[PDB]
Structure 1
Amino acid sequence: VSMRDMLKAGVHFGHQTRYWNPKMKPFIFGARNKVHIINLEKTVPMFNEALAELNKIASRKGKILFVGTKRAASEAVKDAALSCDQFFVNHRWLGGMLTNWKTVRQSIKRLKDLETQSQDGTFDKLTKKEALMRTRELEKLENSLGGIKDMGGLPDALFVIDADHEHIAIKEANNLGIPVFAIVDTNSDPDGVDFVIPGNDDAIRAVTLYLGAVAATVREGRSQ
């Protein structure tokens, strides 16, 4: 991760100046054709520091929740997490997933209670009505809690994409004292964010770049 690849992936394209959060000012570089340019000359140490704090976190029995439901990320944020044996949430964050873990944990208890029935055959015993229902309950709990079935508990770090869209997940992290690493764009607040990577968080290439960097870093941390 160094400057040139960030320009290639368009990390420096922010939102239009009129949608800016004045608190992003310290990472803003310009306002071209009325859109904000992010100062990548800070996206780096910042990001590189975020990547080292993660490692330190991972390399030590680490549990990093990736968070990215913005539909130009869901698929993208699953594989990066999947590539490093970490957990993910890429379809709507359920209010309380962390703060209300004791209740949410019961619905993953339902996911395995029922997924293990898609194989055990139990369905070969229904009026086609109740088994084609328990399946809607599967593909539903698989859609939201699919990537945190194995977390078996609260994490040691979130790597959220779009602090604005994922404002619920961060307030939850903050409330519980789990550090937050996030891509904060020029329209977002970095306040509850512990590691701010000022950068684009809606371009597919930039998000892929961040996710690849984080997943490689976590793989290194676990391997070491």
Structure 2
Amino acid sequence: YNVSMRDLLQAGAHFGHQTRFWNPKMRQYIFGARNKIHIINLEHTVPALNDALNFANQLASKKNKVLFVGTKRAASNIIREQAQRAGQPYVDHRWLGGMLTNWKTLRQSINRLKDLQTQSQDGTFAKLTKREALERTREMEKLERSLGGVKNMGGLPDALFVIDVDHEAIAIKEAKNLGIPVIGIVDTNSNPDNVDYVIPGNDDAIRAVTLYASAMADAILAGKE
């Protein structure tokens, strides 16, 4: 399931953002700049990626939980497919404030969505008229769109996998508050302070995030115990 770095170079993980937006805390991984943008050297990318894959493998083996989080328009469908075929919950859409630190109140909306799914399997809408059916379907739509990811999961996940740490900084803070480890993809214009396993690489490239999430899903599938 390892990438070696053939595929990383092919996908384009080395590319980064412009030199005027960089965070001075990535100087170790900056390596150099071919043009006005930075180029992270994959020499540092591959070992951290391998360790992240091994850690995901070990958690999958001991049955511990990892949540998936990527909310960018580029990575939304990618994490959709990968979390679906890896059988883990996900946050494809916006992170809700306090989803982890205030899980008790979110369980109520989780139960509401699950009960509404049971009602959808039921037939009460046949007795009700078309209008109230149209609304109840639209609350169905909004709650599924917001928190349809985490309905199956019943507790705090034992780890987080973050596509863009700068975009999902709130989830990073909540995970730090509750002690949950985080493995995340970090680019040049990002802060790696609060991430336990810092893998540096590009996040804008759809093919690169596809590679990362496919590697993660393959690791969890290959846990197989």
TM-score (norm 1): 0.96
TM-score (norm 2): 0.96
Cα RMSD after superposing both structures = 1.1
SS of 2:131's partner is coil
Superposed counterparts of 1:187-206, under 5 Å: 187-206=189-208
The structural deviation recorded for 1:20 is 0.8
Match of 1:157 in 2: 159
- Whose strand fraction is larger, Structure 1's or Structure 2's? 1
Match of 1:45 in 2: 47
> Which sits farther off after the overlay, 163-172 or 49-58?
49-58
How many equivalent residue pairs? 223
CA distance in 1, matches of 2:217, 2:53: 10
Match of 1:139 in 2: 141
SS of 1:130's partner is helix
SS of 1:95's partner is coil
User: Structure 2 unaligned runs (5+)?
Assistant: none
Match of 2:126 in 1: 124
Match of 1:56 in 2: 58
AA aligned to 1:89 is V
Flag as ranges the 4+ runs of structure 1 deviating above 3 A: none
CA distance in 2, matches of 1:207, 1:109: 32
AA aligned to 1:150 is N
CA distance in 2, matches of 1:17, 1:199: 15
Q: Which of residues 97, 100, 103 in structure 2 aligns to 1:98?
A: 100
User: Structure 1 unaligned runs (5+)?
Assistant: none
Match of 2:68 in 1: 66
Q: Is contact 1:111–1:138 with CA below 8 Å preserved after alignment? A: yes
1:34-67 CA deviation, whole Å, 9 max, x = no partner? 0010121011111111111111112111211110
1:58-87 CA deviation, whole Å, 9 max, x = no partner? 211121111001011111102211222111
The structural deviation recorded for 1:130 is 2.5
CA distance in 2, matches of 1:158, 1:105: 19
SS of 2:190's partner is coil
CA distance in 1, matches of 2:132, 2:193: 47
